[PDB]
């Protein structure tokens, strides 16, 4: 039974990428704080009990599986695609996610407010021509007031419908009041959408759609994520646990459950 | 944005029931994302948190109170209420109705009341 | 069930004073934690939500810090309006629970 541990998190051979203030997605969404990450890959990417969120307030209905989905996927490239939005404003920001010295949003979203005094029912396509899976990421506002609502969207109540060949979402916005969070008592709720090969998005909204602004490459693979405080050294194990590295020539180990590599068993 | 004013008898006898009431103005309770709180504090104790009512009909109490203690929301007159059994001298305290928002980005499901009522003071006494 | 314990459960301080309280979970919270301000016969005021989110009309005096199982509530320049009862309240489990309170009063 392996009992001991260095405490530090092995560089090798596993491709470590430490999130430090960053959970993965935030990484994704494009927090700014975040936005190091762009494009980065992993084998096992290091989630740590400090990240924090400094962005518009958001919650994510299925955020374990987005999280599990992308973890398991090992990369955040991502590809811009030209989505054209006629009769809204685009690149909205606040100062809820400052950029520099001025508002700012998610990086990889695109706020979309009324243009004028009209905001048209947006409906918008973008086939899948490649051949693997893109994950798009996409959101729904939620103003805190009817004033709100209708000063940003002009239709007294918003709808955001996505879908494909195989799947359907349509998300209605919820109004009213929360609790102030970086001086905002408005909310988004952050969803996603794969889209396999030969197939197609369909974005269809008269209001409070976050837009998409291109898609992640899906990849499958041996990638994962962990939550350890452990830091990171130099040096080689192929067994990670989140109390650190530990030694894998016994068949059992009382570490820790979590595990990833060549590991023994826990016992 | 809303006003909550709280109303019952003030003074109950031993063994039987509480009823509260809370008083809504500036918002409905129909809506589908606030919810509706009781907390209550003994004289010289702490606060204590009762439950929580949402519309849809979601609700969850104190367990150290869930066998005695319901909650119900009034669509007609804009109210909601607690009901309180077999009360005793440990049930006297300030009442406070409150409403919050559901928010899971931040905040366990019905956990966050943020606009409360100034309290009601019920005394258990024969 | 989760156990708040907030430190001091009492202090005084001149005004201008920059005051501290400590909440201390009997578990590992996150962020789940709120900061509630009670002056004699008002209602409960939300001051912080989310450990560090001021709610609306508070003044800026007031900052929430801390997370995980350590959180402070700091009041920078004490006023005599700020006479209170402070109390956290995590949001992390059901039942919501409270700490037993700091009564802050005025030195002058």
């Known amino acids: 039974v392996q009992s001991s541990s260095t405490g530090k998190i092995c560089n090798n051979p596993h491709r470590i990428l430490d999130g430090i203030d960053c959970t993965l997605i935030d990484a994704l969404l494009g927090d700014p704080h975040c936005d190091v990450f762009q494009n980065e890959t992993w084998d096992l990417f290091v989630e740590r009990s400090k990240a924090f969120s400094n962005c518009y307030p958001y919650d994510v209905p299925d955020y374990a599986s987005l999280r599990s989905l992308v973890a398991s996927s090992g990369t955040l490239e991502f590809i811009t695609e030209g989505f054209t939005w006629t009769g809204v404003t685009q690149n909205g920001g606040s100062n809820a996610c400052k950029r520099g010295p001025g508002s700012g949003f998610f990086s990889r979203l695109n706020w979309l407010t009324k243009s004028g005094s009209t905001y048209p029912v947006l409906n918008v396509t973008m086939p899948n021509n490649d051949n693997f899976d893109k994950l798009y990421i996409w959101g729904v506002h939620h103003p805190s007031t009817n004033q709100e609502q209708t000063s940003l969207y002009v239709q007294a109540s918003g709808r955001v419908t996505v879908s494909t060949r195989r799947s359907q979402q349509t998300i209605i916005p919820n109004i009213g009041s929360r609790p102030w969070v970086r001086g905002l008592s408005s909310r988004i709720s952050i969803y996603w959408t794969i889209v396999k090969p030969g197939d197609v998005l369909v974005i269809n909204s008269n209001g409070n759609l976050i837009a998409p602004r291109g898609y992640f490459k899906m990849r499958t693979g041996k990638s994962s994520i962990m939550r350890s405080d452990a830091p990171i050294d130099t040096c080689i194990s192929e067994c990670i646990t989140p109390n650190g590295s530990i030694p894998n020539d016994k068949p059992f180990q009382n570490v820790n459950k979590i595990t990833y590599g060549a590991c023994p068993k826990y016992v | 944005q809303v006003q909550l004013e709280e109303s019952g008898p003030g003074l109950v006898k031993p063994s039987e029931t509480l009823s509260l009431t809370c008083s809504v103005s500036g918002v409905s309770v129909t809506s589908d994302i606030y919810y509706w709180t009781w907390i209550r504090q003994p004289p010289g104790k702490g606060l204590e948190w009762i439950g929580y009512?949402?519309?849809?009909?979601?609700?969850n109490y104190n367990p150290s109170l869930k066998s005695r203690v319901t909650m119900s929301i009034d669509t007609s007159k804009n109210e909601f209420s607690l009901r309180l059994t077999s009360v005793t001298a440990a049930d006297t305290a300030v009442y406070f109705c409150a409403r919050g928002t559901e928010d899971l980005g931040y905040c366990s499901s019905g956990s966050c009341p943020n606009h409360w009522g100034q309290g009601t003071l019920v005394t258990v006494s024969s | 069930d989760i156990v708040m314990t907030q430190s001091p459960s009492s202090l005084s301080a001149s005004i201008g004073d920059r005051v501290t309280i400590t909440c201390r979970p009997s578990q590992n919270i996150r962020s789940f934690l709120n900061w509630f301000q009670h002056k004699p016969g008002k209602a409960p005021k939300l001051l912080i939500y989310?450990?560090?989110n001021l709610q609306s009309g508070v003044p800026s005096r007031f900052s929430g810090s801390g997370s995980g199982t350590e959180f402070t509530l700091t009041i920078r320049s004490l006023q005599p309006e700020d006479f209170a009862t402070y109390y956290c309240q995590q949001s992390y489990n059901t039942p919501p629970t409270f700490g037993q309170g700091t009564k802050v009063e005025i030195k002058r």
């Open positions: 009512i949402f519309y849809n009909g979601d609700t």
């Open positions: 989310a450990a560090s």
